[PDB]
């Protein structure tokens, strides 16, 4: 019974868009 | 060298009552680690006859010239140092999760900008179960926040 143990070598770079509320616009 | 508990497993899964058994969950990890320390060295020369019959002390000046150059270079390396024979910094290894701010319009164009929304959203989006956390920014960047203006003209 083999217990496989696995890790990643290179971590891929991340980039998250820090979206924020748009400007207030009336409904009408 | 030091240990780093990677993750716990999961064992206690709900099951029906009328059965005299259980279920082996999966175990976690320990992930023993290591690390080194790097050296900082260099040399210089003077001239016996020049330094001796000189206007004033040049030696002690070089001493302070080394301790500061060491001081500023270490901190500079500690931030952005490339792994090879230098401490891997937190800027360049790109292990920290990094956000980015989407641009704004101007006269039909689209230029990258840094609004007041961002800095309030960025600082207030940090898991509240990691504890408090200070921030760092260059003096000019804070001088950008201070002099911000709305549509009318008020600060």
């Amino acid at each position: 019974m083999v217990k496989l143990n696995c890790r990643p070598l290179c971590q891929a770079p991340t980039a998250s868009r820090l979206v924020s509320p748009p400007c207030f616009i009336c409904r009408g | 060298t030091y240990m780093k508990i990677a993750d716990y497993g999961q064992l206690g899964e709900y099951t029906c009552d009328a059965k005299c058994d259980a279920e082996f969950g999966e175990p976690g990890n320990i992930r023993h680690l290591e690390g080194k320390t790097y050296d900082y060295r260099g040399v210089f020369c003077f001239n016996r006859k020049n330094l001796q019959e000189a206007n004033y002390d040049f030696l002690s000046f070089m001493i302070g010239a080394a301790q500061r150059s060491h001081r500023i270079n270490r901190n500079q390396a500690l931030m952005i140092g490339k792994g090879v024979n230098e401490p891997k910094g937190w800027l360049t290894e790109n292990c920290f999760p990094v956000f980015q701010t989407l641009p704004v319009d101007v006269n039909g164009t689209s230029t990258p900008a840094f609004l007041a929304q961002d800095w309030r959203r960025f600082v207030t989006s940090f898991p509240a179960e990691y504890g408090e956390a200070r921030s760092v920014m260059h003096q000019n960047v804070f001088g950008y926040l201070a002099a911000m203006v709305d549509a009318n003209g008020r600060f």
Binding site: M1, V2, K3, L4, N5, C6, R7, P8, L9, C10 | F24, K36
Partner: protein, 137 residues
């Protein structure tokens, strides 16, 4: 400062794409595996562990290829139909991620890995090696 980490823990090739290799674990007393891919996979992929005996003609030459009976630990739920050891690389393993494993009871003089039948297409994309731990002489 990196130590000469080749004068202990010396590794050898075990499956270089399309060729198996006997690697002597006689002197050494502990050994594992390091599965690393070179490309993407298609389906699952298994592997068959073996072992060999010193041939009578020369006590330092490979003999036949006998399999290794998989000894169970506690908390085992399934045993391969024949009870012989077998390691499988799970689907969706990216080719920048090493996997580790080993058989828990050594027997013989050296080890061998080979792709289980019907799973020899993906087998090419895999690269397996074996490190060591002790000397004993």
């Amino acid at each position: 400062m990196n130590f000469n980490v080749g004068v202990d823990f010396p590794s050898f090739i075990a499956w270089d794409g399309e060729e198996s290799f006997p690697v002597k674990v006689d002197g050494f007393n502990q050994f594992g595996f390091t599965f690393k891919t070179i490309a993407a996979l298609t389906a699952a992929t298994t592997f068959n562990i073996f072992y060999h005996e010193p041939s009578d003609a020369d006590p330092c030459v490979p003999g036949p290829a006998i399999r290794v009976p998989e000894v169970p630990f506690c908390d085992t739920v399934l045993l391969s139909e024949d009870g012989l050891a077998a390691v499988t690389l799970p689907e969706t393993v990216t080719p920048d991620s090493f996997c580790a494993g080993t058989v828990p009871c050594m027997n013989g003089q050296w080890i061998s890995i080979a792709p289980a039948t019907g799973s020899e297409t993906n087998a090419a994309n895999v690269q397996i090696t074996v490190t060591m731990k002790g000397a004993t002489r």
